[PDB]
Amino acid sequence: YRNAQNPSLHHPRATFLGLTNEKIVLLSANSIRATVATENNKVATWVDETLSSVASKLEHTAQTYSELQGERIVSLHCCALYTCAQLENSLYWWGVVPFSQRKKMLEKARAKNKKPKSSAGISSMPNITVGTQVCLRNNPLYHAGAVAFSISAGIPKVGVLMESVWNMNDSCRFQLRSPESLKNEEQWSLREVVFVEDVKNVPVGKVLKVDGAYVAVKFPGTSSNTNCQNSSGPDADPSSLLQDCRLLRIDELQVVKTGGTPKVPDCFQRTPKKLCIPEKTEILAVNVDSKGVHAVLKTGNWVRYCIFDLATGKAEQENNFPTSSIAFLGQNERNVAIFTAGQESPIILRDGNGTIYPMAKDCMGGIRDPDWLDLPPISSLGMGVHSLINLPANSTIKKKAAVI
Amino acid sequence: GKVLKVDGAYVAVKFPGTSSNTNCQNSSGPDADPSSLLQDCRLLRIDELQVVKTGGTPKVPDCFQRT
């Protein structure tokens, strides 16, 4: 880094974070997210430089809200989706909710988005005027024209979609909104989509006429894929726009209430809340994975390995080691560590002696009795997601792998 | 009715009185305003109009005696 213009300031996103005159002590960095805790017990959370345009909801300056207790944050972790922080006796997480959580929230929206549908009883006649705020009855919930980031294939990407995914388990084809275009169709999966377009923005289909028992509506940019140029100037072809209009029946529309958003909920958690942990359970180490948040809980001479679920706030999967807890605690209390990538990688557990604790699961579901490794004690372990490249015709070799 | 658009099972056909609140004269030729043709359409479907074969005179005799 050589900032010729201003050598006193580095990391050109730093002035966005407001950390030009602050002392920082804690760092948490991964593929796309970033968080730094400063001497002012203030945590700044932000994204990569590439996703700067979406940082409005994805970047936070260093500030401790009244929701936070204001105490000394013990440590931090952050995945590609959300940030978790560790106090002495508190674990607080916030950020974009997991894909399953977003889907189940959409269920609370998609069902309620079916509000205009009448019941079995004699419903009252709706007040209808030509040009009133209504949209399409069907619930794609996401049409072409929304840009979001998917971090699959070992390389993060941000792009727009092309068709609405009717089946929430089927693949789809998108188009990247690469910055160089302003200065490729890909068959993807919906697990990695964030949908940063947020509230509304789905209905822009201005209702333009009502005739017979039908409505005439044209969405912007509904021209066909023919080689004819989409003339947006004053000399636009009337016949092309004639062939590109939409004619629907009034039964195929749902009412857009005055001031009522078509979807409503937020695909982002801006507020902290408690990751439920029992009393006196000292947290040996923390890490953020796809299933939730990893932890090692202690009470007396009792050591447990747990993964905490987002929705309930408690440890979804708790297990007691088959070996004695005194060995795992070891001589050095702090030398324990938990390692995970955040979305897709095996976990690593590090105990006091300096070496590693093997992991395997029995058919019951608990931790297998470990098979010892003859490894010497380890000091640092770097874990990362690396995508193998130049795959011949998308062979059976997997796209991504873990580097340890 | 001159069906100017056919899209799937739906058709856009023009009829007199299809104009919007605009009172401008119906200039549907080369100088047709896009808003004019956009708000001066009539909505029908395929199952609402029967096809008339081109070049075939419909059987419409006059019911008025002349001789």
Among B32, B38, B42, the residue with its CB nearest the CB of A218 is B38
Q: Which amino acid is at A197?
A: E
Interface size A-B, in CB pairs within 8 Å, comes to: 46
Buried b (16+ CB within 10 A) or exposed e, A237-247: ebebbbbbbbb
Distances (CA, A) of A160 to A164, A185, A297, A393, B47: 11, 10, 42, 25, 37
Residue contact A245–B41, C-beta within 8 A: yes
Nearest to A208 among B32, B38, B44 (CB): B38
Residue A120 phi/psi, 5-degree rounding, is -70, -25
CA atoms in the 13 A half-sphere facing the CB of A29: 5
Please tell me what DSSP assigns to residue A50.
G
Of B10, B20, B37, the CB nearest to A242: B37
b/e map A188-209, b = 16+ CB within 10 Å:
bebebbbbbbeeeebbebebbb
Q: Are A283 and A91 a contacting pair, CB within 8 Å?
A: yes
Closest CA–CA distance from residue B15 to any residue of chain A (Å): 11
Task: Provide, as residue numbers in chain B, all residues whose Cβ is less than 8 Å from the Cβ of A235.
Answer: none
Distance separating alpha carbons of residues A330 and A381, to the nearest angstrom = 19
Smallest CA-to-CA distance from A267 within A107, A34, A98, A75 is with: A98
Q: How far is CA A339 from CA A88, A203, A262, B26, in A?
A: 20, 44, 41, 73
Distance CA A358, CA A355 (A): 10
Residue A220 identity = P
DSSP letters spanning A67-128: SS--S---EEEE-SSEEEEE-SS-EEEEESPPHHHHHHHHHHHHHHTTTTS--SS-PPPP--
Asked if A239's CB is within 8 angstroms of B43's CB, the reply is: no
